[PDB]
Amino acid sequence: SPQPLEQIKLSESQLSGRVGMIEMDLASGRTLTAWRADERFPMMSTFKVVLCGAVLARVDAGDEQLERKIHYRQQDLVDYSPVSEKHLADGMTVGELCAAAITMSDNSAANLLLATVGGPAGLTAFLRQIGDNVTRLDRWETELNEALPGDARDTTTPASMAATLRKLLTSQRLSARSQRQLLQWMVDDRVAGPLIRSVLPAGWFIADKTGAGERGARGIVALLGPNNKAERIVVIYLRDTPASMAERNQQIAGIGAALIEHWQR
Numbered sequence: 001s002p003q004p005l006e007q008i009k010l011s012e013s014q015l016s017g018r019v020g021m022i023e024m025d026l027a028s029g030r031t032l033t034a035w036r037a038d039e040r041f042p043m044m045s046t047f048k049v050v051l052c053g054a055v056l057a058r059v060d061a062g063d064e065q066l067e068r069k070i071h072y073r074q075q076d077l078v079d080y081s082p083v084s085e086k087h088l089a090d091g092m093t094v095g096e097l098c099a100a101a102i103t104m105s106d107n108s109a110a111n112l113l114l115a116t117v118g119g120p121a122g123l124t125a126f127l128r129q130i131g132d133n134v135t136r137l138d139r140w141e142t143e144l145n146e147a148l149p150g151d152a153r154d155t156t157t158p159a160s161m162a163a164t165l166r167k168l169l170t171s172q173r174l175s176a177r178s179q180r181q182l183l184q185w186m187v188d189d190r191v192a193g194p195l196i197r198s199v200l201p202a203g204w205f206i207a208d209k210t211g212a213g214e215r216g217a218r219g220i221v222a223l224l225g226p227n228n229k230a231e232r233i234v235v236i237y238l239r240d241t242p243a244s245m246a247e248r249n250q251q252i253a254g255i256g257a258a259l260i261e262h263w264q265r
């Protein structure tokens with residue numbers, strides 16, 4: 001594979017779309033690679049990580065409990081609820097909803113949680129509270145994935161997302177237990193985690209949340225690193241490309257490959 005920056009460019013050329021990327025040291029926030037880092041990209045399902053960060057903040061504040069059981073109705077369910085559709089009779093705890101939203105990308109679980117934090121406006125306010133003045137959530141699942149051209153709704157920038165993730169996971173804004181919890185949810189992703197591990201060389205750590213949207217929108221926020229350590233935050237977003245899912249997956253994997261082969265920068 002070629003150098004990270006050149007692979008990224010090659011992906012735009014082959015996809016005919018915009019790629020947004022950031023590679024950042026998790027512990028210090030040192031930025032190694034930045035491409036269209038300040039350009040807007042739809043967050044898609046990657047927003048669920050920030051959503052649960054806000055939930056944990058409420059738990060830390062004593063205004064929420066991961067144990068609190070939420071009961072909902074079939075009428076509250078939206079497209080794709082693999083976990084939540086199974087507990088119409090017994091409900092799910094707030095903690096279970098975050099696990100389902102992050103590890104299975106359950107959409108109803110995400111909406112249920114979104115309500116508890118004040119809807120899209122409330123999560124956006126939370127973002128502003130932690131110093132992210134760029135990221136914004138405006139809609140609920142699954143409308144937030146529309147990815148209309150030039151539409152600023154439900155977007156983030158690679159730079160903003162990486163900084164926010166690092167804040168949630170390491171800045172001690174969240175309690176130690178909460179930071180560890182958010183990390184474990186990403187470690188437990190069942191949607192892309194196993195697949196990624198199946199292609200990662202031995203010794204490489206992976207934690208993540210992926211997303212997909214209209215007009216080729218695709219994305220991943222992840223922790224990656226050799227020697228089995230979450231050394232770096234890697235955020236990659238794609239938009240406005242007519243390419244198949246398979247090819248968009250391949251291009252992202254290719255950027256990952258360039259990182260792996262040229263890790264020491």
Ligand SMILES: OC[C@H]1O[C@H](O[C@H]2[C@H](O)[C@@H](O)[C@H](OCCCCCCC3CCCCC3)O[C@@H]2CO)[C@H](O)[C@@H](O)[C@@H]1O
Nearest residue numbers: 001196199200201220222224234252253256257260261
């Ligand atoms: O010298 C480095 C390595 O080169 C290969 O590893 C290959 C691997 O066989 C392939 O499957 C992967 O593509 C997959 C890359 C990861 C896909 C997900 C990437 C994500 C994860 C984090 C966010 C960014 C994107 O590339 C690497 C690097 O060439 C060898 O197989 C391995 O023995 C050797 O250690």
